Write a protein that binds this ligand. Sequence first.
Ligand SMILES: [Mg+2]
Ligand SMILES: [Mg+2]
Ligand SMILES: [Mg+2]
Ligand SMILES: [Mg+2]
Ligand SMILES: [Mg+2]
Ligand SMILES: [Mg+2]
Ligand SMILES: [Mg+2]
Ligand SMILES: [Mg+2]
Ligand SMILES: [Mg+2]
Lengths: 108, 138, 199, 176, 109
Amino acid sequence: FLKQLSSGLLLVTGPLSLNRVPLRRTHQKFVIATSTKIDISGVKIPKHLTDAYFKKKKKYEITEQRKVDQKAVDSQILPKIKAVPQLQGYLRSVFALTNGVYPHKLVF
Amino acid sequence: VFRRFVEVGRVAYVSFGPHAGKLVAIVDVIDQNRALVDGPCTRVRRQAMPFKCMQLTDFILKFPHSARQKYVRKAWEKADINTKWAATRWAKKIEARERKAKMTDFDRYKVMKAKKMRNRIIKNEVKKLQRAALLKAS
Amino acid sequence: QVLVLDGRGHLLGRLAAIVAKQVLLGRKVVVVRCEGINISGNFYRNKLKYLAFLRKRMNTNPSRGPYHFRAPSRIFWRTVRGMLPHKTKRGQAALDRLKVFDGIPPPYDKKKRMVVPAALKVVRLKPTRKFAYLGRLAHEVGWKYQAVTATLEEKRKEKAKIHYRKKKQLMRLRKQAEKNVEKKISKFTDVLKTHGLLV
Amino acid sequence: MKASGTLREYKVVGRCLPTPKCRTPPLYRMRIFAPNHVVAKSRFWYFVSQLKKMKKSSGEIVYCGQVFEKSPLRVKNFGIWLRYDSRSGTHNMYREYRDLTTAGAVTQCYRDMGARHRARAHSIQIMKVEEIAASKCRRPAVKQFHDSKIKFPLPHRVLRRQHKPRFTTKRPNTFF
Amino acid sequence: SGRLWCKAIFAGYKRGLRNQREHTALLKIEGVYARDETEFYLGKRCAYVYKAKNNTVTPGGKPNKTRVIWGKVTRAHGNSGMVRAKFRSNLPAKAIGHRIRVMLYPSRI
RNA sequence: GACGGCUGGGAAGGCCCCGGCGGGGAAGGUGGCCCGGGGGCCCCGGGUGUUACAGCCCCGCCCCGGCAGCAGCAGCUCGCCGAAUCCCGGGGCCGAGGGAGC
RNA sequence: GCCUAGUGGGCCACUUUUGGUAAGCAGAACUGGCGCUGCGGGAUGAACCGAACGCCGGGUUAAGGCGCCCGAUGCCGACG
RNA sequence: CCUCGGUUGGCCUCGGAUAGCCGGUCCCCCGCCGGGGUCCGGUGCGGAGAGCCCUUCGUCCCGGGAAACGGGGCGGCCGGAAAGGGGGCCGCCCUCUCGCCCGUCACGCACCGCACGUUCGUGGGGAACCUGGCGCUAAACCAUUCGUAGACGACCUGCUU
Ligand SMILES: [Mg+2]
Ligand SMILES: [Mg+2]
Ligand SMILES: [Mg+2]
Ligand SMILES: [Mg+2]
Ligand SMILES: [Mg+2]
Ligand SMILES: [Mg+2]
Ligand SMILES: [Mg+2]
Ligand SMILES: [Mg+2]
Ligand SMILES: [Mg+2]
């Protein structure tokens, strides 16, 4: 997670070099917030990455601007991910429920 | 053969109730199923506590059967039960249960990968010892 | 997916209540070793209870009357059926989810059996109260396969001891293997010790 | 009275209404063991109406207060003199208890009478409760705890939390 | 890649003894055996997934045989972790004892 | 999560014999001493007795002794409360009405 | 104030009460019920307990309950 | 292609005692490695079901760790009847140094916030067409007969060495 947008949607990227999740909106009632964190105080989010930017338009292709914005945020947030050990693999993994593992008991 | 006896000065571990997870000293017995206890170093006020919620430990203080809280604390901090209780395997397998309770998702991922390795490194040498038994049994 | 319960040391109605609730909540249950179920009260009292059960029959046609099954498996089955709403389709499906056995048959002897502490004799009865054995009650009321079940049970137990001795040899080999490789697993043992999975 | 929960002891002081005959009536103090002060004042009017010729209409209550135990950390022996109605006859008793509070002692007496004698709280009258020293006790179930170096184990520890897994593999340990 | 829903059982309708209220369902969630544990699941969405004979359209997909009665958790039911849930259509009584997926995403944490 | 009132202007309890200086007392009798036996000086028995090599109970103020604190930071030793009471958060159900004007 | 239908076989219960050995018997008083009335509870049930009813959603209760049938203690419930 | 649907990682196992258990151990004493006395640990069971195993986004470069005795796969031996073992093991003429962990390096429909997703699943059942090999060419009933049988059915019998 990076920044809350002006419509309340959560601007997010778990980086495309790890997740195949781009710069994208999500919704806070539909995401689980784990208590593992990266300091992104020095991260310049571009000012134009807004809800008007992320709104669906109308056969879908990534524009060159959307290609270069994902790089411009990944080249900054990725050295912060790789400076804490095993978090890149942690983000590469997906979350799944298995036997005996109950969500009211697991603390995230 | 019983080893743990309810007596004046036995440290008991409180299993449930409002003072669970704590250590008390049995100061006196009232009747069949209730004892005046007192934890002056584990923050438990002197009170009647039933026997079914305390679990007896292998620690016996020496104080009289009507001596007050400060003599109980004198015996407790002279015997150093706050460190001798922690040195036992009982408190270590309590705090291991606490740590597995406090595991976060990143913690569970790192545990999964480290255990994924440790089991395979042991598992190869287990079979290595097995065929080192069959090749040396003949 | 199957709940396999060792019937030894359990009380009949307590186990049958818990099994009836599980097969209503939709879990296939296999209760093995039903001759090891205990019944509270003295044996003469329990024997005359089942003798009063036997005295009941349809006076005009006992072949239509109440079927007094003699095997401990079928007696336990009848208690669960009396605890189930067996005259509806949900009740019949609940009963059909439940299997009962005498001894521990070959599907379930190479399987771990569960125990219910809320139905156990040692938990649920005072130690001075006299109990009875379902196998002995069953045999003395007309079950014929008590001795052969006992012979097959000692035949199963003597192989279970073989499996147990091999399991112990494997686990001591596991312990020698840990003390062998405690140089190259020491950087991975500390993770499991800091997160409380080992000590 | 329905002896609900832990009883509380109340000092209830009452008197008659001052008539032109009796310009200031004498004041009567009673210790009532009751669930709350409303029940305490009602039992006070019961007992005072039984002892004197004084009613709630002709009388008043000038004080009703819970009397706290002066030593609720000290184990004491309690002697309770009792009057109760059985199914046939009325009996005087004396019973002995062990507790930290005299209100806990009286409610222990009420549940004990309900257990041993099938007697409900409406048929039981406390007459006197006194903290008795250990030498002057007459009941061996109280007197057996009068030992300085007392020592007993907990022999057959039954498994409580019978439904924590409800389906475990390992049969329980009851020795500890 | 893996399971994302909790397992629950359609234990029955909200009922007394002789009056069952079909509009409210009683769920038994696996792992919840106390009323204190129910506080996570209150408000969560629950799905009765079932297959039928004719195909129906799948959102974000091609038509197949799976069909869903959607619902959500409203309140706990009793001390032992059973839960009351309300669905869009009242659940069929053929589903009693069968599985209801309890989704994770009316997230509160 | 935070505040306050009342009570026996809470009761007990905590710290400074570890409250000071005195006076006693007895036991569910601590040291000692005596008896008895069980071990390798120690423990458990039985007796005696008043502090000693534990404790308990009854100028107690030597300004209610002096301090904390106070119906007590667990998220429990025992209450009744709130003009002496407020803040914050979560779950569920529902959106009737349709020209209010300025 | 007028017109007026139906009714003019009753039965049950706390308390009082007469005859009778007694009766799910016969006869009165007071009040409440049933008849005329479903509903929750007493397994079942004219009368008992709770409560009286338009068609529904949420909440909460009464009397009853909470091993399983069967909703609810699967409380590490208290003392016997 | 229909249709029936449920399901959404497995646990491959001492006997049991509960005023007692569990695991190692020889200097022992008995038996065909099994049992007991001795000793050592453990016991609110951590040789723990408050558990264990597996754990999956995928691919590309190069490095370290672990592995090398390994990973994948054709010919033999053991293992099972209460409702029978799909396992362990012997070699093979093959192939790789990958799999697992910590890193370097980028990539992929990034489908633009959204739901039945993700398995067990070459699931069971049903018909049908392909498409190659090994094969195998039957009874039941009626009818007739019998009378050890019989109301009728049924039953018992015979019908080319
Ligand atoms: Mg009459
Ligand atoms: Mg009549
Ligand atoms: Mg009529
Ligand atoms: Mg009327
Ligand atoms: Mg009515
Ligand atoms: Mg009845
Ligand atoms: Mg009434
Ligand atoms: Mg309603
Ligand atoms: Mg009932």
